[PDB]
Structure formats: C-alpha cells, structure tokens
Design an enzyme around this catalytic site. Structure first.
Site, PDB file in Angstrom:
ATOM      1  N   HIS A  41       0.806  -1.220   0.000  1.00  0.00           N
ATOM      2  CA  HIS A  41       0.000   0.000   0.000  1.00  0.00           C
ATOM      3  C   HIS A  41       0.843   1.276   0.000  1.00  0.00           C
ATOM      4  O   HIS A  41       0.262   2.362  -0.029  1.00  0.00           O
ATOM      5  CB  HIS A  41      -1.013   0.002   1.162  1.00  0.00           C
ATOM      6  CG  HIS A  41      -0.436   0.305   2.517  1.00  0.00           C
ATOM      7  ND1 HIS A  41      -0.371  -0.633   3.526  1.00  0.00           N
ATOM      8  CD2 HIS A  41       0.041   1.456   3.051  1.00  0.00           C
ATOM      9  CE1 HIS A  41       0.137  -0.081   4.614  1.00  0.00           C
ATOM     10  NE2 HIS A  41       0.407   1.183   4.349  1.00  0.00           N
ATOM     11  N   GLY A 143       3.178   5.644   9.969  1.00  0.00           N
ATOM     12  CA  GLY A 143       4.547   5.480   9.545  1.00  0.00           C
ATOM     13  C   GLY A 143       5.206   4.210  10.021  1.00  0.00           C
ATOM     14  O   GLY A 143       6.355   3.945   9.637  1.00  0.00           O
ATOM     15  N   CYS A 145       4.235   1.122   9.311  1.00  0.00           N
ATOM     16  CA  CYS A 145       4.084  -0.036   8.433  1.00  0.00           C
ATOM     17  C   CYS A 145       5.428  -0.464   7.864  1.00  0.00           C
ATOM     18  O   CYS A 145       6.342   0.346   7.677  1.00  0.00           O
ATOM     19  CB  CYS A 145       3.109   0.249   7.296  1.00  0.00           C
ATOM     20  SG  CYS A 145       1.449   0.435   7.906  1.00  0.00           S
TER      21      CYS A 145
HETATM   22  C1  LIG Z   1       1.094   2.204   7.935  1.00  0.00           C
HETATM   23  O1  LIG Z   1       2.165   2.996   8.497  1.00  0.00           O
HETATM   24  C2  LIG Z   1      -0.223   2.389   8.690  1.00  0.00           C
HETATM   25  C3  LIG Z   1      -0.078   1.895  10.148  1.00  0.00           C
HETATM   26  C4  LIG Z   1      -1.326   2.241  10.958  1.00  0.00           C
HETATM   27  C5  LIG Z   1      -1.500   3.752  11.146  1.00  0.00           C
HETATM   28  C6  LIG Z   1      -2.102   3.885  12.548  1.00  0.00           C
HETATM   29  N1  LIG Z   1      -1.742   2.649  13.221  1.00  0.00           N
HETATM   30  C7  LIG Z   1      -1.309   1.724  12.371  1.00  0.00           C
HETATM   31  O2  LIG Z   1      -0.971   0.593  12.673  1.00  0.00           O
HETATM   32  N2  LIG Z   1      -1.244   1.628   7.965  1.00  0.00           N
HETATM   33  C8  LIG Z   1      -2.343   2.206   7.513  1.00  0.00           C
HETATM   34  O3  LIG Z   1      -2.545   3.416   7.634  1.00  0.00           O
HETATM   35  C9  LIG Z   1      -3.364   1.320   6.847  1.00  0.00           C
HETATM   36  C10 LIG Z   1      -3.293   1.492   5.325  1.00  0.00           C
HETATM   37  C11 LIG Z   1      -4.554   2.276   4.940  1.00  0.00           C
HETATM   38  C12 LIG Z   1      -5.474   2.347   6.147  1.00  0.00           C
HETATM   39  N3  LIG Z   1      -4.676   1.801   7.244  1.00  0.00           N
HETATM   40  C13 LIG Z   1      -5.062   1.756   8.516  1.00  0.00           C
HETATM   41  O4  LIG Z   1      -4.396   1.274   9.411  1.00  0.00           O
HETATM   42  O5  LIG Z   1      -6.340   2.346   8.849  1.00  0.00           O
HETATM   43  C14 LIG Z   1      -6.775   2.402  10.209  1.00  0.00           C
HETATM   44  C15 LIG Z   1      -6.152   3.584  10.928  1.00  0.00           C
HETATM   45  C16 LIG Z   1      -5.412   4.537  10.227  1.00  0.00           C
HETATM   46  C17 LIG Z   1      -4.861   5.627  10.899  1.00  0.00           C
HETATM   47  C18 LIG Z   1      -5.042   5.743  12.274  1.00  0.00           C
HETATM   48  C19 LIG Z   1      -5.781   4.791  12.981  1.00  0.00           C
HETATM   49  C20 LIG Z   1      -6.332   3.702  12.305  1.00  0.00           C
HETATM   50  C21 LIG Z   1      -4.389   0.838   4.458  1.00  0.00           C
HETATM   51  C22 LIG Z   1      -3.921   0.615   3.015  1.00  0.00           C
HETATM   52  C23 LIG Z   1      -5.112  -0.349   5.109  1.00  0.00           C
END
Ligand SMILES: *[C@H](O)[C@H](C[C@@H]1CCNC1=O)NC(=O)[C@@H]1[C@@H]2[C@H](CN1C(=O)OCc1ccccc1)C2(C)C
Ligand SMILES: *[C@H](O)[C@H](C[C@@H]1CCNC1=O)NC(=O)[C@@H]1[C@@H]2[C@H](CN1C(=O)OCc1ccccc1)C2(C)C
Lengths: 306, 306
Positions: A41, A143, A145
């Site tokens: 992603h 950040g 991921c």
């Molecule tokens: C990648 O760094 C990020 C990690 C998330 C961000 C907040 N806590 C985490 O573990 N991954 C994502 O943002 C993924 C990505 C987009 C949506 N998503 C996600 O986690 O959504 C839920 C979320 C986002 C932000 C804050 C709280 C919850 C996809 C492609 C699934």
C-alpha cells in the site's frame, strides 16, 4: 530468578531496516540481500486507499518513483514486483548486514518480537503474541508499516510478520513475509473488524509454571481434574480447548516443578471460577496468556543467541 | 495506537557485550574503546564470596588470569584496575563497534532497557524501572552479571546499570557504570534485603494518560482534588507524594488529553479507594507504575533513534 516479557535482541533486524517513500507515503522496508520488502500500500494515495486495484497501480509505477534510504544513503531501485500484499523492490546493493534468516509463518498462540520503526529508524522492541483471531495487540502509529516481527534461533532470524494496518478496536493486522495476511483482513479501507478472540489456554498454564518456578505458589491445590472436565470449564470462560499435545508440551515444566499438568489445570479452574481475590501472580492481577511454554523454558533457564 | 512495555533497540549494546572468565567464574563484560567493564566479584571464588577483601584479591591477580572473549575472538588483557565495585580490564583492542555513549546514574522512578546476557551472548531485552528502594524487578539467572541497563538518546547510549546480584525476595541489585551501587547493597553475601518499596505516583498518572490517549476512559470523573488532599490519599496507599514538579512534567499529557492533572489525580484517588471492579486499563488489572511521562510521550508520538 524473575519473569519479564522479553524480546529477542533486535540488532540483527535493525541492520535490515530502511525507509521506503513513494509519492506522499513513507514507510519502512526490510532489506535482505538485494531486495527490499515493504507493504504494497506504499504505492497508494489517500484517494487510492478506499478500493484500490494494486496491479493497475503497480504497472503505472517506475523504478525511480521508489525512494529507498538506508540510513543516510540512497539505494537505487532496479526492479519491482508484487508478491501478494508485499512489494519486492530489487536494489543495486546487497545488504552487507543481512543475517541468516528464514521466512516463517507462525500459528496463533505463538509469540514474536516486534521492532517498531519509523522512517527506517528503529524506535523500540517488544513482545507480541499472534491472537487466536489473527490480530496482534501492538503499539503502532502512522509510519510504522513495514516494521517486522521475528524470532531468533541461534544466529538465524525467522521473520514472521510485517505490519500493515490498525483495526477499529486498536489492534493490529499484517502479513507474513510472503505477503499473505494473518486472518481475514485486506489492505483496503473497509469496515473490517477483528472478530471474537479467545484466551490461549496452554500459554496461561505455562505462565502458571513460570510463577511456581519463581516462588508464587498460593494458587496451587491438592485437587485434580480430567482433561475433559477441565475443557468444559475452559469453554465457559472463553478459553481455548487444551489438547493432549498441549499437555505433552507442558511435560518438561511439569517435571521441573513436580506439578502434574492436570493438577495445574485444576488450579487454573479454581482461578477462573473464583478470581484471584486481591492476589497477584508474577506481578499481574490477570491470567497472562502471551508466554509460550518455550518462552517460559527459555527465560527460566537462560538460552542465548550468537 | 496501542501501548506496550517497550525497550530500546538493543543493537548498539549487543556489539559491546563480551565474556569475562577468571578462574571458575564466568560473567559478562561491557567493551567500550579499549576497556572491558565487569563486576569485580569475578575475581572471587565461592569461599571468597562470604566476606572478601577485593583489593587483597585483586593484587594477587595477573593480567593473564582474565580470559576475555568477544564472540569467538580472545582479547588480551594488558591492564586491570578496580573502580568501586567494577573492574576495568584494559585490553589490546578498541571495540570497533563502540557507540557514542555516556555513563549516567538514574533516579528511582526512571526506566531503562536491560539486555540480558549469558557467556557474552545477548539473550533478551526488556524494560525495567529503578524502584524507590533502588532495586529492579528483572529477570536474571546465574551468569547474567555484567548485563547492562541503558537508554538511547538519538544515537547516544546512556549506560545506567550493571547487574551484580539477586536479593532474597527475587529482586535485583547492581551498580552504575562507575561501580557505585544503587541502594544500600554490597557485593558481599550477607543477610541484606530490599527494604520497603512504594508506588511511583507520577508514573501511574502518566500511564492513566496513556490509557486515555488510547481510548480507555471509564475511570474518568468530573471530580477534582487539591494536590494536598490527593497526597493524603497517596500515603495511605503507600504511593509516593506528588510534587508540583511532577504536575509540571505531566502538563504536556494534560494538554493533549484536555484532562487537568489534578482531575486525573481525582480519578486515581477513586481507583485507589474503590479498585477497578472487574475492569482493566491498557490490558492491566493493576495500576502500572513503570512507565515515565517520557515513556508515554515517546510511544504515544513515535520518536526514533539513528
Ligand atoms: C502504515 O504505516 C499504517 C499503520 C497504521 C496507522 C495507525 N496505526 C497503524 O498501525 N497503515 C495504515 O494506515 C493502513 C493502510 C490504509 C489504512 N490503514 C489503517 O491502518 O487504517 C486504520 C487507521 C489509520 C490511521 C489511524 C488509525 C487507524 C491501508 C492501506 C489499510
Ligand atoms: C552473577 O551472574 C550473579 C547473578 C545472580 C545469580 C542468580 N540471579 C542473579 O541475579 N550474581 C551473584 O551470584 C551474586 C554474587 C555472589 C552472590 N550473588 C547473588 O546474587 O546471591 C543471591 C543468589 C545467588 C544465586 C541464586 C539466587 C540468588 C555475590 C558476589 C553477591
């Protein structure tokens, strides 16, 4: 003595962490030999992220769109491909710090160490279990991921997890290093939710044995139970059934303490039905289920890794 | 989101760990530049260990008595001296992996990461707090002495702890890296015992703020209290007094959550007087006091280290 939630030394993994930026998205990659692994992603934009077609998105990408930085040194991307939900970025430099490693997929109930990272820089290390519902109770911000989970066996790093997302209950979901999600989750923004969890029974018993080894004995009793009668009480309190293989796996801990597995089950039964009544076990007022029989034996014996 | 007991990445410290053997005693040393630091009781024998005179013991030693091994490579000892309760072994090779480091001494209530080691090989990493009684609740077996505790600040390792011994309650005692014991302990086999501990109040409040940040709010209330009236309840439950400096240190967490420090104190009051009544906070059924306001801000924001 003492018993602590303990992670593996993170050094071998720290040397593999890099930063991957594409467009406006920055995340972590795992650099092994001449390949950088990262969540696919990274190719997305916020309007891509609701219902993306990743093959479509990837064919429109160029090698030079991917900015890979290992510390303060830029890595030239020379190829890219998608493997399930991860990207493999071929770079022009093999990581000289590549440890001996394997890509393994773990079972729910198994534990591993997470090296939390941001912008390719390791932030912290901690221990997680794969929940029965294939989520992990981690600590992950934007950040993070591409941070990985791993175990170390002598000198060999078995990578088992790459972080992708947080679910609405605040728990975390990701893939093995072949890009296949743990559990019924997709790297899509949908209404997906964790799903009902259970307590890892064999792990609770292992932790009870850790407690005994460390001098907590107040929950011991003279009662016993059959495996069948214990498992009736298990379900009742939303614990996983205990199998004869679990009993076998607990044999060494049973032999060290002199407490038969089924007798420890009788203790667990009473703890489930009565609570702890103000007392603690290994500094916890809850029955802990994120230590495996392996974790207990390792720590209550002292294995190392070179 | 999520909140986990998180250690610093251990890699920079792993590169400093060596094995020190003298006679029948094997333990760990910390190799920085051309000096190996280790607990001075490595010069002891089991009949030395009841009431030793370490200066007497050290003058009878020779450089060649000290076997130092860094991985599979022997380090020649070329000098030795005692500094308080640690030995400084001068070796013929400077550690090429020496990080930028400082020797700092921490305060009770402060936390640090421990890299548990055996035979010079890192085994595990975990987070500890210095208790008000100058002990730490660690996980240490025979052969773990010389394992160090540390914090990392950007790229700089602040070493604060070297492990020496276990007390009869199963808690652990050691020195700073200048060899001065934390607390009223000696590297002698005596009847020494830990001494009465207290709960680190400012840390509990920080952890409550971590809980709020992560969506646990059930313990919040509309009440408030004065600092004085809170501190009366503190003592009562064997909590440390809360100072205005503690209130100041909690300001940023108060400003992020919109919960005045004194209002969070009112919540803590009710938790102390009523218990939790079957509920948990950040997966704990106990009030946790081993996270500092710094630890909460770091993890609930995402600082890294390069
Ligand atoms: C990648 O760094 C990020 C990690 C998330 C961000 C907040 N806590 C985490 O573990 N991954 C994502 O943002 C993924 C990505 C987009 C949506 N998503 C996600 O986690 O959504 C839920 C979320 C986002 C932000 C804050 C709280 C919850 C996809 C492609 C699934
Ligand atoms: C050094 O490796 C060792 C670490 C101890 C061993 C068990 N848990 C630990 O943290 N230190 C010692 O053995 C010190 C040393 C000798 C006594 N001692 C000690 O810790 O005694 C208590 C003990 C020993 C063994 C098992 C349980 C408790 C002196 C010089 C203080």
């Amino acid at each position: 003595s003492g018993f602590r939630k303990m992670a593996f030394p993170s050094g071998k993994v720290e040397g593999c962490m890099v930063q991957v930026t594409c467009g406006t998205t920055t995340l972590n990659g795992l650099w092994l030999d001449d390949v950088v692994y990262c969540p696919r992603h990274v190719i997305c934009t916020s309007e891509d992220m609701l219902n993306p077609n990743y093959e479509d998105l990837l064919i429109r990408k160029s090698n030079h769109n991917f900015l890979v930085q290992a510390g303060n040194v830029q890595l030239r991307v020379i190829g890219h491909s998608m493997q399930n939900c991860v990207l493999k970025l071929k770079v022009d430099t093999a990581n000289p710090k590549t440890p001996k490693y394997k890509f393994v997929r773990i079972q729910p109930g198994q534990t591993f160490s997470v090296l939390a990272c941001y912008n390719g820089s390791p932030s912290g290390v901690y221990q997680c279990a794969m929940r029965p519902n294939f989520t992990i109770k981690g600590s992950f911000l934007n950040g993070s991921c591409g941070s990985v989970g791993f175990n170390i066996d002598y000198d060999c790093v078995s990578f088992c997890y790459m972080h992708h997302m947080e679910l609405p209950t605040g728990v975390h979901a990701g893939t093995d290093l072949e890009g296949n999600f743990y559990g019924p989750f997709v790297d899509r923004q949908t209404a997906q939710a964790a799903g009902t969890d259970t307590t890892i029974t064999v792990n609770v018993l292992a932790w009870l044995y850790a407690a005994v080894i460390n001098g907590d004995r107040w929950f011991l009793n003279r009662f016993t139970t059959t495996l069948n009668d214990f498992n009736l009480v298990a379900m009742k309190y939303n614990y996983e059934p205990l199998t004869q293989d679990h009993v076998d796996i607990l044999g060494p801990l049973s032999a060290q303490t002199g407490i038969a597995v089924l007798d420890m089950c009788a203790s667990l039964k009473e703890l489930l039905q009565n609570g702890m009544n103000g007392r603690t076990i290994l500094g916890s007022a809850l029955l802990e289920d994120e230590f495996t029989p392996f974790d207990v034996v390792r720590q209550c014996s002292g294995v190392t890794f070179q």
